[PDB]
Symmetry: D2
Subunit: 121 residues, 4 copies
């Protein structure tokens, strides 16, 4: 019934988001992996007037991995599309950049892919 809701990726991370009428994404992310505990703030944007031809809805969001419990000195962005239907899905690719010195900046950024559904593990 839309982007707003509670989503889970293939690792069991929990993505709770609200899609504002004019394109805002606002919520929290709890990661099952990495140097992370509890919830982290997220913010992003989505296409609030998608095509009407069967295409998905483009979107993206960011988390910086600092909260009251931990600071990993890193940030992830997810870029992807929402696909509506009986089992709604958000398919993404992500970039996780850690703060580095300039000379190790070559090993600063991990890449991967996450797919989200509203099915709770």
């Amino acid at each position: 019934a839309g982007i707003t809701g509670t989503w889970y990726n293939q690792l069991g991370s929990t993505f709770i988001v609200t899609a504002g009428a004019d394109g805002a994404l606002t919520g929290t992310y709890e990661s099952a992996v990495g140097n992370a505990e509890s919830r982290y703030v997220l913010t992003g944007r989505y296409d609030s007037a998608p095509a009407t031809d069967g295409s998905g809805t483009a979107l993206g969001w960011t988390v910086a991995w600092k909260n009251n419990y931990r600071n990993a000195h890193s940030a992830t962005t997810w870029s992807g599309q929402y696909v509506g239907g009986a089992e709604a899905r958000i398919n993404t690719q992500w970039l996780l950049t850690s703060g580095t010195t300039e000379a190790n900046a070559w090993k600063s950024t991990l890449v991967g892919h996450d797919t989200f559904t509203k099915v709770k593990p």
Copy 2:
């Protein structure tokens, strides 16, 4: 966060206007020199508000959805990178641009690249 807050440009001639809040928020507007884009677009992101002090960059990311009250490309970009302070401040990024597609075309939905931003003097 004084360092990040300001006006920036990338190697394509795009410009990025941003304000870094005490809570880790990035807000502002983006004007792209390339692609299916005109005028300013809203951006929103996050940064590490308590970075290391050991000669590391400050991790940050932001998103633009390419819809404004003038044009809609049905697409969104995220930039992931780090701010490097000092007199010649830079934001070094890699980005992902996803277009809305049909399922059969999803394999060709996402472009990747890298942008370098240089800060300019208010």
Copy 3:
């Protein structure tokens, strides 16, 4: 029983490969998608002495999309790992670069992910 064999990705593309003893990958690729028909030459490398701790086997390969039938003026590289087991798998991330002018070089490279098994569709 190893990297050598016939593999299929989630799109139904066919990847036929031989893993040489000292690290070569040599074979053909037939793509179910894009500006492609029939087989294309591939070449790559893999770790011919992987860790013995349960880790996967790192690898990569390239196809340039020119054969006797078509030339798309593009090339893909896949980077990933082989995971042995009862349903062996190769998990990859890929980059597809098209030849462009310098000023459109910003839109030259697509990214995605392919997972391969030996199960024929």
Copy 4:
């Protein structure tokens, strides 16, 4: 293919020695300035042997597995990019470096980046 064939360097100080064959093959050796690497490693790749003549680059890619008779990092890099000819010839790339990992650690297996190669004069 005279253009591609030769010695190249990237912005990290790594060097790439390559021979472009008539059949579309790339062969050679790579010496990395960074990471868990020493001495030369085999590379192998492909390029478009009949590129456009319309002022486009020539698409190419190659792979190195980081095992040689001296060291083994249990990892591999692929570079995907284009050759831009002329007097100041360049190869502009983006790359993926995958390390062998356990299944539980596969989420952190792959680094991404970009390398610029400049040709040097035999």
